[PDB]
Nucleic acid binder design. Structure first.
Ligand code: DGT
Ligand code: CA
Ligand code: CA
Ligand code: CA
Length: 341
DNA sequence: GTTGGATGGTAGC
DNA sequence: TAACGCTACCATCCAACC
């Protein structure tokens, strides 16, 4: 198998640089302004010039402005970015129809039938990079390896504006040498737990009793790590099938008054239901972010599909359930649809 | 004995 | 100092179904 993974560089900020070339080469910070007070909200993403000064995805806009007051601050235009993305995913389909879109800015291509070895895979990667540059003026990072996980690791090593092959021999090397926290699917919590068992590299999973690994990080993560360690991880590339679609919005001010929260909930529903595009969901969850930023939800699965009308009725009840069973004020409110027919 | 819904945790797999 | 937005997959706990 040969997998080619593509991830667009500083995507939203880069799209804004393409739409306004005079922004290029100086700090650009793409923001979601929440309206709670002047400059309330969070950074969605920043370009690399901005990142050098600590302005990155997830920090507050007021914190960013304290560091880079002279940066260019642009509101998030997600619809514009989705259009560029979709045009790029369609360019990627011309190189292989076996495509797994994994996010708004990344995809895995199985090119096993389009190229014969890694040398040709590398040349195709450069071809892909050059094409997206010609058509969309977007730079990307390409990772190439024998499976999805290592193609991902290869891109991570190579970003930004990179291309990198991890061949069979280097996979064997990384199984021994790569820090296990840098393996996709291993964050802070799982890494810490693995340290307590003395597992720092993938290779170390081959030494521990299966039930002890399973007991600490669970069956699925244990199977996954051992499979990578054996070099027998072989998840095929498959067409993305979206499993849930949702929208959460932020309120001008925290509240537990149902009548004040309803307008927001209902906008979340309108936007979410529009995003369904023909899909008919059987489950609905109302999702609230409380005043202390804890996430709570209540949901319901129906034996049949949920109409817009039923979504309205049922979401109000689920919001009432949250209010009755949780003391806290609500900061953000939204909805998630799943279990599509 | 399973199956799967409700809720939440982990990691962007 | 304040913290927006989006989603797949898994774990635990529990009721329903044999
Ligand atoms: N609103 C919001 N959007 C985010 C957040 N994180 C990522 N995104 C969106 C904006 C990014 O441009 C886009 C792609 O995510 P990536 O993780 O690949 O980061 P990005 O491409 O911006 O930087 P890149 O060079 O990979 O490092 O997804 C976030 O915390 N909030
Ligand atoms: Ca990216
Ligand atoms: Ca990405
Ligand atoms: Ca990690």
């Amino acid at each position: 198998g040969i997998v080619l993974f593509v991830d667009f560089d500083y995507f939203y900020a880069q799209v804004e640089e393409v739409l306004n070339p005079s922004l290029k080469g100086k700090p650009v910070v793409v923001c979601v302004f929440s309206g709670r007070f002047e400059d309330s909200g969070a950074v969605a993403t920043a370009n690399y010039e901005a990142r050098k000064f600590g302005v990155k995805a997830g920090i507050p806009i007021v914190e960013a402005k304290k560091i880079l007051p002279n940066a260019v601050y642009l509101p998030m235009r997600k619809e514009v970015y989705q259009q560029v993305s979709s045009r790029i995913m369609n360019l990627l389909r011309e190189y292989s129809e076996k495509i797994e879109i994994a996010s708004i800015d990344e995809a895995y291509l199985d090119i096993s039938d389009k190229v014969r070895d890694y040398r040709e895979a590398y040349n195709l990667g450069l071809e892909i990079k050059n094409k997206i540059l010609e058509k969309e003026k977007i730079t990307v990072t390409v990772g190439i390896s024998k499976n999805k996980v290592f193609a991902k690791i290869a891109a991570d090593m190579a970003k930004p504006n990179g291309i990198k092959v991890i061949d069979d021999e280097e996979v064997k090397r990384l199984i021994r040498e790569l820090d296990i926290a840098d393996v996709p699917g291993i964050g802070n919590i799982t890494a810490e737990k693995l340290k307590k068992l003395g597992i720092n590299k993938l290779v170390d999973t081959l030494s521990i009793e299966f039930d002890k690994l399973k007991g600490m990080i669970g069956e699925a993560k244990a199977k996954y790590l051992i499979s990578l360690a054996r070099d027998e991880y072989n998840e095929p590339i498959r067409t993305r099938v979206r499993k849930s679609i949702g929208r959460i919005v932020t309120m001008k001010r925290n509240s537990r008054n149902l009548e004040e929260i309803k307008p927001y909930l209902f906008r979340a529903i309108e936007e979410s239901y529009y995003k369904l595009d023909k899909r008919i969901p059987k489950a609905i969850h109302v999702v609230a972010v409380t005043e202390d930023l804890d996430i709570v939800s209540r949901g319901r699965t129906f034996p049949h599909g949920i109409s817009k009308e039923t979504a309205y009725s049922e979401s109000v009840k689920l919001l009432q359930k949250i209010l009755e069973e949780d003391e806290r004020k609500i900061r953000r409110i939204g909805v998630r649809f799943s279990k599509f027919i």
